[PDB]
Design an enzyme around this catalytic site. Structure first.
Site, short mmCIF file in Angstrom:
data_model
loop_
_atom_site.label_atom_id
_atom_site.label_comp_id
_atom_site.label_asym_id
_atom_site.label_seq_id
_atom_site.Cartn_x
_atom_site.Cartn_y
_atom_site.Cartn_z
N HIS B 74 -4.25 -9.83 12.71
CA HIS B 74 -2.83 -10.17 12.57
C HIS B 74 -2.51 -11.50 13.20
O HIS B 74 -1.73 -11.60 14.14
CB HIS B 74 -1.96 -9.05 13.12
N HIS B 78 -3.86 -14.88 8.68
CA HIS B 78 -3.19 -13.84 7.89
C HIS B 78 -1.84 -14.28 7.39
O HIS B 78 -1.50 -14.04 6.23
CB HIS B 78 -3.08 -12.56 8.72
N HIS B 112 6.08 -13.26 8.99
CA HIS B 112 6.21 -11.79 8.89
C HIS B 112 5.48 -10.99 9.94
O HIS B 112 5.82 -9.83 10.16
CB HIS B 112 5.81 -11.31 7.49
N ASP B 113 4.47 -11.58 10.58
CA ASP B 113 3.75 -10.91 11.67
C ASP B 113 3.83 -11.66 13.01
O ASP B 113 2.96 -11.49 13.87
CB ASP B 113 2.28 -10.69 11.28
N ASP B 223 1.12 -8.72 1.64
CA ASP B 223 0.61 -8.28 2.93
C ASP B 223 -0.80 -7.69 2.82
O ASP B 223 -1.62 -7.89 3.71
CB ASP B 223 1.56 -7.27 3.59
N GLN B 275 -11.82 3.45 3.24
CA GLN B 275 -11.34 2.38 2.36
C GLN B 275 -11.07 2.90 0.95
O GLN B 275 -10.02 2.59 0.37
CB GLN B 275 -12.33 1.21 2.34
O1 15J Z 1 -10.46 -5.80 3.13
C1 15J Z 1 -9.62 -6.25 4.20
C2 15J Z 1 -8.24 -5.58 4.16
C3 15J Z 1 -8.38 -4.05 4.28
C4 15J Z 1 -7.01 -3.37 4.25
N1 15J Z 1 -6.07 -3.97 5.26
C5 15J Z 1 -5.10 -3.15 5.87
N2 15J Z 1 -3.81 -3.55 5.84
C6 15J Z 1 -2.83 -2.84 6.38
C7 15J Z 1 -3.10 -1.63 7.02
C8 15J Z 1 -4.42 -1.18 7.08
C9 15J Z 1 -5.43 -1.95 6.49
O2 15J Z 1 -6.75 -1.56 6.54
C10 15J Z 1 -7.13 -0.25 6.55
C11 15J Z 1 -6.62 0.66 5.61
C12 15J Z 1 -7.03 1.99 5.64
C13 15J Z 1 -7.97 2.43 6.57
N3 15J Z 1 -8.32 3.73 6.52
C14 15J Z 1 -9.35 4.33 7.13
N4 15J Z 1 -9.44 5.65 7.26
C15 15J Z 1 -10.57 5.92 7.90
C16 15J Z 1 -11.17 7.11 8.31
C17 15J Z 1 -12.40 7.09 8.98
C18 15J Z 1 -13.02 5.86 9.24
C19 15J Z 1 -12.43 4.67 8.83
C20 15J Z 1 -11.20 4.70 8.16
N5 15J Z 1 -10.42 3.74 7.66
C21 15J Z 1 -8.49 1.52 7.50
C22 15J Z 1 -8.07 0.18 7.48
C23 15J Z 1 -6.04 -5.44 5.48
C24 15J Z 1 -7.42 -6.11 5.34
ZN ZN Z 2 0.93 -8.60 7.78
ZN ZN Z 3 3.05 -6.53 9.90
#
Ligand code: 15J
Ligand code: ZN
Ligand code: ZN
Ligand code: 15J
Ligand code: 15J
Ligand code: ZN
Ligand code: ZN
Ligand code: ZN
Ligand code: ZN
Lengths: 318, 318, 318
Positions: B74, B78, B112-113, B223, B275
């Site tokens: 962040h 970004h 925004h951040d 975002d 993911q």
């Molecule tokens: O590829 C880079 C982008 C990935 C998604 N991004 C996100 N943006 C806003 C909020 C969250 C973001 O990344 C995440 C989204 C979901 C997860 N979910 C998740 N659940 C899990 C369960 C076990 C282990 C790992 C996990 N990650 C993790 C990171 C920004 C960078």
């Molecule tokens: Zn952001």
């Molecule tokens: Zn934000």
């Protein structure tokens, strides 16, 4: 007068540093705030206490420091390390170099990677960086020299202000050529020419163009001197250079370009063979040729050979 | 006059950047000092050379930069990345938006951040941070907007000083709503409403409340745009976000609270499935709905779909 | 007057912090800009709202902060953490200490590692650092105290300016002895003497030399208090100290000296046994003796015992 009071001054380091700074394999240590003093000491011993006005030199040194970046390898520590190797070459060939050359070469070494971003000339070209538009060849090196001149142009920073214009122009040319010579792409042709001239006996240090070439090789030798340290230093420093290279490889992948194995972190396992190849193709021939031209630089070659043996030991799984 | 001299000026980037900046999947690169110029270029092309006084805009940009923190994800990079995605949306739907909206949305994205610590709203609440006492909902987002206004209030920083008070109030409302919309907790209800209005045909961009909702979705889309880049960019950027999330998980454990698997570094192996679940539940529906409303944003959805396929390939051990 | 307006002021923390700050195992959190307020709160509650002029104290605190380095463990966070442990000891033995001692000890704790480089006294000696030439014993600790006095000597920084000269001299002596006592090499002899005096009943807090010894042990107890936190805090903090130690080991190898397993990253696997040995030989005896002398410090010993059990669980592969 000020120059008279300076002549009475003696700059000293701690006992261990005074002794070991004379050795080619000296490591400058992790105490950053001691590096300026180490450089001043080296200037004092190799040039003289009256070569630079101390106040101006200190101001210059701190500004140079400020213009190195917080990158893993091409940083302030590298600059001082390269400067020390030059010091050791100068001190062991003290008969050969003029007053201007000793002044110029230590400064050139200190300034030789100024404002380095941790990326190669190749990457800047492929990214289409503004620097690559200004400097078609030796992109970063031309920038390093430009940075040097800019720092010298700052108020109270002209460490060469006591020189005549003629001498000033000469020292700046020495510095320019030396810094450009650190472009490793230029090393291969330079060493080849030097080897040929040495074997025929045409090599002549009284010939300016030949002298420029030898200085060039000295610059390569100092630039690569991390391979001439004791094994623990050499091996740990390898971590720093690969940190930079792998980051560049990442950036190459982001441009949609497959990086060469050298820059690719997925090829981690090939590092020992990669280093072996580098010692064989670049490092050993460099120090071999340098030792032929300047025999007192022999310890650099011996230490490089020892590190080659260590990499071979890594490869065998030993 | 000053505005006349500005009208004669043309801001240009390097050749590769001029071409590739128009693509949705453009990556801004590792040269931080080029990002301000990239933003100015985008403002110039999407708004016009007379939209902002250049001196004020540059001052504003540097102050915004100074108020982003050195956190893994962040950060300043970004901010500019999100701004670029907005630029691409604006340029490909250039007919739809007013002068004020183009000005406002690029600035909103850049800001925004602002002052993000690398911790979620959830963590600030559980820690009992003073910000959570002031802002019960959308804690960080309300702070981001507060930071924006504070920067605008600095001497020589009001980039909107040429606007009437009426227009100034409008642009600040645009910015406020846009920044609040980046609270991902609010995205789910927003997208659901938008989908329903789209399918019935009640969705109307001439209706301010509907327009606010579409802008909201655009903000979510920008975002999350790291998931719409080419695979090497998307995969490497995932390392940055998890660095932040795992640090938060550590801090949760220090509060004596078991973090969710997302924030837990001990659950590293579940990242690919995590993911996949995120693309299925959040990213794909976002870009699907956005493409329905604004068809020229189609490349975002295609690239997101391609990255989903890549994560599936990781899961299979391929 | 200014002191009158200060008497009307009440400094408060967030609800969770107000409650949990009283617990020995409190963790100060990841929000750096809250630490100054946490320290001021502790000073207010343990000393009083009229102990320091608020403007001077804030100026002092920020200068102390600026003189801690960005190292993995011996940093600003450690300083405030050690200060908090002292606060908890003071508050639970509130009957025992004078006004000067409460003032002095919190300040001593905040300042006790000022300008730490992340290297031990041993390394500075072997490197031949200028500090080792000036201070033959307790090298870093004598430097920490020197740094403290220098900060106090800055304009508007003398937080003790309301004291008589007699009281000023006393508080500075309290601070000096306390900081020197954090040299762990001195802890072993101190604890042994204290144990003997306690068992015979000769130990007397009305005897200045005995009192100095108890304060010394309190300083050791606060310095090591990371081992008295809850397991997640203790375990994660271990990562920070080893980051420093392994860096020192690297530097030892660069001097051509084989480091002890504690400082050697190649001995990573022996960490759990190394910690067990440390708890057995140092941490447990420290808190055991402290609890004997000051029974209300019992929670420190209990928490230390719990962490010993956790390390034993790691060793068994459980
Ligand atoms: O590829 C880079 C982008 C990935 C998604 N991004 C996100 N943006 C806003 C909020 C969250 C973001 O990344 C995440 C989204 C979901 C997860 N979910 C998740 N659940 C899990 C369960 C076990 C282990 C790992 C996990 N990650 C993790 C990171 C920004 C960078
Ligand atoms: Zn952001
Ligand atoms: Zn934000
Ligand atoms: O021991 C530390 C020194 C190592 C050599 N150093 C270099 N100086 C200038 C340019 C490059 C330097 O390091 C190299 C040299 C060659 C390579 N070659 C190489 N080829 C590889 C193929 C596969 C995997 C790794 C590879 N590394 C990598 C790094 C400075 C630090
Ligand atoms: O849990 C975090 C605290 C751990 C103890 N801390 C220390 N404080 C002062 C001095 C040393 C501290 O940590 C130690 C203590 C003992 C060791 N001993 C040790 N011996 C080893 C042998 C082999 C491998 C690792 C070893 N660690 C290492 C680090 C502060 C942070
Ligand atoms: Zn270079
Ligand atoms: Zn170099
Ligand atoms: Zn200490
Ligand atoms: Zn300490």
């Amino acid at each position: 007068t000020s120059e008279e009071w300076q002549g009475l001054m003696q700059f000293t380091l701690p006992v261990r540093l005074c002794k070991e700074i004379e050795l080619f394999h000296f490591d400058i240590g992790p105490f950053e705030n001691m590096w300026p003093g180490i450089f001043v000491y080296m200037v004092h011993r190799s040039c003289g206490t009256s070569c630079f006005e101390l106040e101006k030199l200190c101001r210059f040194i701190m500004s140079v420091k400020k213009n190195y970046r917080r990158v893993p390898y091409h940083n302030w520590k590298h600059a001082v390390t390269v400067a020390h190797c030059m010091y050791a070459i100068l001190q062991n060939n003290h008969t050969l170099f003029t007053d201007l050359e000793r002044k110029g070469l230590l400064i050139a070494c200190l300034c030789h990677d100024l404002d380095h971003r941790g990326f190669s000339n190749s990457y800047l070209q492929k990214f289409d960086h503004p620097l690559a538009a200004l400097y078609s060849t030796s992109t970063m090196e031309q920038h390093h020299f430009s940075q040097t001149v800019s720092i010298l142009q700052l108020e109270g920073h002209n460490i060469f202000s006591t020189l005549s214009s003629s001498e000033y122009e000469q020292v700046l040319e020495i510095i320019r050529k030396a810094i450009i010579a650190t472009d490793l792409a230029l090393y291969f042709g330079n060493r080849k020419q030097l080897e040929e001239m040495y074997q025929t006996g045409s090599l002549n240090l009284n010939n300016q163009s030949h002298r420029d070439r030898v200085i060039g090789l000295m610059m390569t030798a100092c630039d690569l001197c991390s391979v001439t340290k004791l094994w623990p230093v050499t091996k740990l420093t390898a971590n720093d250079i690969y940190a930079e290279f792998w980051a560049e490889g990442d950036e190459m992948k982001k441009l949609g370009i497959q990086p060469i194995p050298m820059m690719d972190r997925d090829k981690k396992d090939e590092v020992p063979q990669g280093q072996l190849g580098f010692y064989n193709a670049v490092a050993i021939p460099c120090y071999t040729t340098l030792t032929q031209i300047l025999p007192p630089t022999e310890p650099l070659l011996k230490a490089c050979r020892d590190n080659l043996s260590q990499w071979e030991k890594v490869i065998r799984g030993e």
